[PDB]
Amino acid sequence: PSIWNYDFLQSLATHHNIVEERHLKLAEKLKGQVKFMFGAPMEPLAKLELVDVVQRLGLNHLFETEIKEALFSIYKDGSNGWWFGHLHATSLRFRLLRQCGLFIPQDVFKTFQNKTGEFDMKLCDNVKGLLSLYEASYLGWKGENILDEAKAFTTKCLKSAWENISEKWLAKRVKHALALPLHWRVPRIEARWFIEAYEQEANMNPTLLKLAKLDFNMVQSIHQKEIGELARWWVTTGLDKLAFARNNLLQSYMWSCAIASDPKFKLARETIVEIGSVLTVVDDGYDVYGSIDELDLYTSSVERWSCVEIDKLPNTLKLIFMSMFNKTNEVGLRVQHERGYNSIPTFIKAWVEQCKSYQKEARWFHGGHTPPLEEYSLNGLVSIGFPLLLITGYVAIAENEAALDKVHPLPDLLHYSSLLSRLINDIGTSDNLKSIHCYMNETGASEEVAREHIKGVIEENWKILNQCCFDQSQFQEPFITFNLNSVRGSHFFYEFGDGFGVTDSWTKVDMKSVLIDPIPLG
C-alpha cells in the first residue's frame, strides 16, 4: 500500500490502530513510574539526560510540568562544579536551558578554547562531548562567535572521527546529527527514529522505551483517523482533480502534524492541513492554470473577498477560487462554534497577502524580470505560505477575538520562520524564479556558489529566529514551537531535493513509519 493511494488513505478513518483498554492502563502505569523518575533525587547531569531522552522520544508532551521544574531547578543551582570543565555536561546544560527560554551565555565554552579562540584539540577522544557541543552550537544567536567556532570545530572532528567510533549506537547518533542537527529536526519524526535508536543504546531505560512506543501508537491512532477523514474530504470535493500532476496529500498532513502533533491540537492540525492543501491548489492556479490578467481578477476578487463578480474568471480558476473561499469560510464558522470568535477577517488579510505575493511572482515571471534578492525575499517569505498557515494555527489557539490582532503586522517570529522555509524550499528545487537566480543576477555568481551563499543566509536567519524565540512578550509556547516546527518541516521535506511535490520520494519512508505503521510491542 502506497501513501499516494487515496483509497487506502480514506480507509484509515475506520481501519486505524485500535488502542486496547490494557494499553490505556499500562500507559497510565508507566506514566507514573516515569513521574517518579523525575521527582527522585538524581545527579544534575543525570536529570538533564532524563529530560533529553524524554523530549527525543516524543514523550515530552506527557511531562511538561516535570521537565520545566527539572530544567528550572538546574537553572539556579549556583554550584557549577558538576559541569564546569565538562564538555558534554556544559553542552547539554546550555542546550536544554536555552531551548526552554532560559538564557545561558556563550561564555560557558571559553574554558574549552585556547587564547586564540581555538577549541582545544584534546576533546576528540570524548566524541559524545563533541556531539553535545555540536548540538548546542545550533542554539546560537547573531554575534555569538564562540558558538560558530564550536559548530565548525565539532563538524570537522565528528566527520573525521566517525569511522573510529567503536560504540555502534554513538556512530548512528553522530551520522544522524551530521545530516541534520537535532534543533532542525521535527520532534514527531525524530521521536520515531529515536525510539528505534534508544532501544539499542547503553543504559536505555526499558520503562521509558515501552512508554514511548505505547504513547506513539496511541497518538498515531489519532492521526490516522484525521488522515482518513482528510482523504475523504479531498476526493469528495473533487480537489483531487484541481491538483496538477500531484498525489501528495499525505505530505500536507505530515507538515501539519509536524507543526502540532499532540492530539489536543486537533483544530490547529486539521485547520492547517485543510488550508494548506487548498493553498497547494491556488499555488497550482497561479503557476499553471491562469494568465497574468486572469490572476489579477483572482487577486482582486480575494481582496474584496466576494464570490459575486467572479463570473469573469476562467472555469478552472472559478472552481479553485470557490474551493479556497468556501473552505476558509467553513473554517471561520467552525472556529466561531468552537472558540466563539470571528477569524474570517484575520483569514482574509492572510489570503490577500498570500495571493498578492503569488501575483508579484506571476508578473515577474510573465515580464521576464528577476528582482534583487532582498525584494524577492520579502515577498518570498509570504508566497511560501507559512504566514497564512502559521496564522491559521494561531487562530486555533488564540485566547480571544482581540488576540488575533497580534498577527497584523506580521510578527518577527512568523517573518523569520517563513523566510527560512522559503530559502530552504528554494535550495531543494532544480524556469521558475528563486532566491538562487536572484543572487546570481545581482553578483554574477554561479549557480553552485549562489546555492552555497543562500545556505549561509539560512544559517544566519536561524540565529535571528533563535534569539527571537526569547521575546515571549506577545507569543508563548506552544505557538513558538509551532513556528520552529514549520521550519523543521521544510528541512525534512527538502533534505535531498523535492520531497514535498514529488509523489514518490525518500519522504515516504518516514511518513509511513510516523503516520501509518504502528510500532510493535508484544
Name which of 397, 443, 423, 434 is nearest 491 in CA terms.
423
Cell of 233: 474530504
Sign of CA dihedral 393, 398, 400, 406: negative
Give the architecture-level CATH label for domain 22-218. Alpha/alpha barrel (1.50)
**452: which residues sit within 8 A by CB, 6+ positions away?**
none
Distance CA 314, CA 163 (A): 60
Count CB-CB contacts under 10 A for residue 240. Answer: 15
Helix 386-395 / helix 249-259 crossing angle, nearest 10 deg: 60
3-state secondary structure of 201: coil
Secondary structure letter of residue 515 according to DSSP: I
How far apart CA 132 and CA 480 sit, in angstroms, is 23
Q: Work out the number of other CB atoms within 10 angstroms of the CB of residue 288.
A: 10
How many Cα atoms sit within 13 Å of 181 on the Cβ side?
20
Residue 488: CB partners within 8 Å, gap ≥ 6? Answer: 184, 185, 186, 187, 258
Q: Which of 249, 253, 238 is nearest to 2 (CA)?
A: 249
In the chain, after which residues is the C-to-N distance over 2.5 Å, breaking the chain? 430
Residues 250 and 9 sit within 8 Å (Cβ to Cβ): yes
CATH 1.50.10.130 residue window(s) in the chain: 22-218
CA distance 324 to 65: 40
The experimental resolution of this structure, in angstroms, equals 2.6
> In this structure, what are the phi and psi dihedrals at residue 119, rounded to the nearest 5 degrees?
-70, 135
Which residue in the block uniquely carries the three cell numbers 523525575? Answer: 38
The closest alpha carbon to 55, from 195, 149, 154, belongs to 195
CA 68/CA 108 separation, integer angstroms: 22
- Name the experimental technique: X-ray
The residue to which cell 551530521 is assigned: 178
Burial class (CB in 10 A: 0-12, 13-18, 19+), 164: exposed
Distances (CA, A) of 240 to 271, 353, 508: 18, 25, 20
Name the residue with cell 532566491: 435
Sign of CA dihedral 394, 395, 398, 402: positive
Q: Looking at the DSSP assignment, which residues form a beta bridge with residue 119?
A: 113
Binding residues for (2E)-geranyl diphosphate: 246, 283, 287, 422
Nearest alpha carbon to residue 269 among 215, 331, 320: 331
- The number of CA neighbours under 13 Å toward the Cβ of 350 is 31
User: Three-state DSSP class for 113?
Assistant: strand
CATH architecture type of domain 219-522: Orthogonal Bundle (1.10)
Helix extents (H) in 340-411: 344-366, 373-383, 386-395
Torsion of CA 492, 494, 500, 502, to 10 degrees: -130
C-alpha cell at 446: 554561479
Three-state DSSP class for 266? helix
CA distance 310 to 300: 10
Binding-site residues for Mg(2+), please? 283, 287, 425, 429
- The single residue listed with the C-alpha cell 544522524 is 176
Q: In whole angstroms, what is the distance from residue 446 CA to residue 451 CA?
A: 8
| First and final C-alpha spacing in the chain | 24
Positions of CATH 1.10.600.10 in the chain: 219-522
How far apart, in Å, are the Cα atoms of 336 and each of 81, 328, 344, 398?
A: 54, 12, 9, 12
Which grid coordinates belong to 327?
473552505
Cβ(59)–Cβ(208) below 8 Å: yes
User: In sequence order, which residues have a C-beta less than 8 Å from that of residue 23 and are 6 or more positions away?
Assistant: 214, 217, 218
Feature table: binding site: 246, 283, 287, 422, 425, 429
Indicate the length of the chain as a whole number: 522
Residue 125, phi then psi, degrees to nearest 5: -75, -40
